[PDB]
């Protein structure tokens, strides 16, 4: 079935490879920050942990390895580009799936990374035969278990425990201080709680971008290499355009195709269309970091098991903004409450500034938060933009509307979204006497009803004065700092 004489390996520039020191590795977010300036223009990068950093995989317990059942979905590789979704495949265990992968590669190739690459793209671009594989993707680790260890109180001290509390343990990365995802109380699946990816040969994850343009960290626990292709975030649009240009009929059929994660396009074609693509080979025991709005794709060289999770340093806050705004224009539903994260971050930073005002002891956390807030600070800039947006949106409301101050438990329990935008309304909501428990964003308050303003009101979580007070507090306004440290 293999045909190496017709291989179509795409000759693509390598994504940068980093070799963090133990020092660097003690501070995940800091290290990611230093990485930013060096690899953000590449979209993705490969991170090799310091020597002998190899956390034990609990999935290798044969109690889980041979018994824990997980679902798979069927991928027709020859259909990924030229031609729709993935259909329900048979249940597997890690043992079973590894055995079938061995069987598959034995049948298909009777095999190094570039051979598998050339053959894969051979199948995708040109289509001799139907090739059908399975992927156990997007498996909940809270259901299945994590590839990382957890703390067990009653048992002897072990390196496993140290790994369990390590920051690069993907169960711990999302809510590290410096990541605004910490301010989301719900253990959002995939975004905050890591997801598992069990692979076989040719197993694909098609072109896509993280939800809310978040950072993505992917650890390969065990098995064969995972090949990655990444696009820089600042070329995202370009990429998209090329898709529209090179798969016209598929986009005539599905204008929302990109968000469906079932379409693959070769890096060769992308290079010939002027889109910068960068290659990375993730081997067992290594990390792959995806930057905000960095389109990425790739496949598996054989049986493996990966674990991915989102992370959101302060620098992400400007992208995460655009995203939700974009979502509003796409009228697509979100995965998280952005304003909750922004406001949460601002509140924590204000708390730290308040502590410094009391000449409290400066901790590393306090330092990290102070460092990103002042009239030059990224957090300050983000909050400032959001507040400006708020004031313009309110300014554009015609006079009539009443104000009711939103009670704090307004987003707890229930996600509240603009009926038209699906814009998250954690900060502001508009309504009328026509529609209790039915709201719009400040931009679409107009479109909610036909009623006159007498009946129109707006739930506000914070008055405009209070918001501007927050911006001033980040810039050192002690009174404002006192104000927001109380909330």
């Amino acid at each position: 079935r293999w045909n190496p004489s017709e291989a179509c390996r795409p000759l693509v520039d390598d994504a940068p490879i980093f070799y963090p020191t133990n020092e660097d590795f003690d501070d995940p977010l800091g290290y990611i920050e230093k990485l930013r300036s060096k690899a953000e223009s590449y979209g993705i990068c490969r991170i090799v942990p310091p020597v002998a950093w190899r956390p034990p995989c609990p999935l290798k317990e044969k109690k889980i390895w041979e018994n824990s059942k997980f679902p798979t979905r069927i991928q027709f590789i020859d259909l990924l580009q030229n031609r729709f979704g993935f259909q329900t495949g048979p249940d597997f265990t890690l043992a079973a799936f590894q055995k079938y992968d061995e069987y598959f590669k034995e049948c298909y190739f009777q095999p190094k990374v570039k051979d598998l690459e050339g053959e894969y793209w051979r199948i995708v671009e040109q289509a001799t035969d139907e090739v059908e594989v399975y992927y156990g993707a997007d498996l909940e680790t809270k259901k299945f278990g994590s590839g990382f260890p957890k703390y067990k109180p009653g048992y002897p001290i072990s390196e496993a425990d140290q790994y369990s509390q390590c920051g690069w343990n993907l169960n711990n990365l999302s809510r590290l201080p410096g990541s605004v995802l910490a301010f989301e109380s719900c253990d959002i699946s995939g975004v905050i709680v890591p997801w598992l990816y069990v692979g076989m040969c040719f197993s694909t994850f098609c072109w896509h971008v993280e939800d809310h343009h978040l950072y993505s960290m992917n650890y390969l626990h065990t098995g064969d290499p995972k090949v990655w292709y990444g696009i820089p975030g600042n070329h995202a649009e370009s990429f998209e355009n090329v898709m529209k240009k090179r798969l016209p009929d598929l986009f005539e059929e599905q204008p929302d195709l990109l968000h469906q994660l079932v379409t693959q396009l070769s890096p060769r074609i992308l290079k010939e269309e002027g889109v910068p693509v960068y290659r990375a080979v993730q081997r067992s025991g290594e990390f792959i970091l995806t930057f905000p709005k960095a389109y990425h794709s790739g496949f598996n060289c054989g049986f493996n098991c990966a674990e991915a999770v989102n992370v959101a340093p302060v620098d992400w806050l400007v992208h995460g903004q655009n995203a939700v705004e974009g979502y509003s224009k796409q009228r697509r539903k979100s995965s998280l409450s952005h304003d909750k994260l922004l406001l949460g971050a601002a509140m924590e930073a204000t708390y730290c500034l308040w502590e410094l005002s009391l000449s409290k002891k400066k901790t590393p956390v306090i330092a990290r938060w102070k460092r990103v807030c002042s009239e030059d600070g990224l957090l300050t800039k983000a909050v400032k933009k959001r507040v400006q947006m708020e004031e313009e949106r309110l300014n554009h409301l015609q006079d009539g509307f009443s104000l009711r101050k939103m009670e704090g438990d307004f987003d707890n329990k229930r996600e509240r979204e603009c009926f038209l935008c699906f814009y998250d309304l954690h900060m502001s909501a508009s309504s009328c006497k026509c529609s209790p428990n039915r709201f719009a964003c400040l931009i679409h308050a107009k479109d909610l009803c036909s009623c006159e303003s007498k009946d129109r009101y707006i739930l506000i979580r914070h008055t405009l004065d209070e918001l501007w007070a927050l911006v001033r507090a980040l810039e050192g306004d002690l009174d404002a700092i006192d104000l927001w440290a109380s909330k």
Binding site: R73, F86, D138, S189, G190, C206, H208, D211, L261, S335
Partner: peptide
């Protein structure tokens, strides 16, 4: 419920 995307 609250979730990441799936193909």
């Amino acid at each position: 419920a609250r979730t990441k995307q799936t193909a």
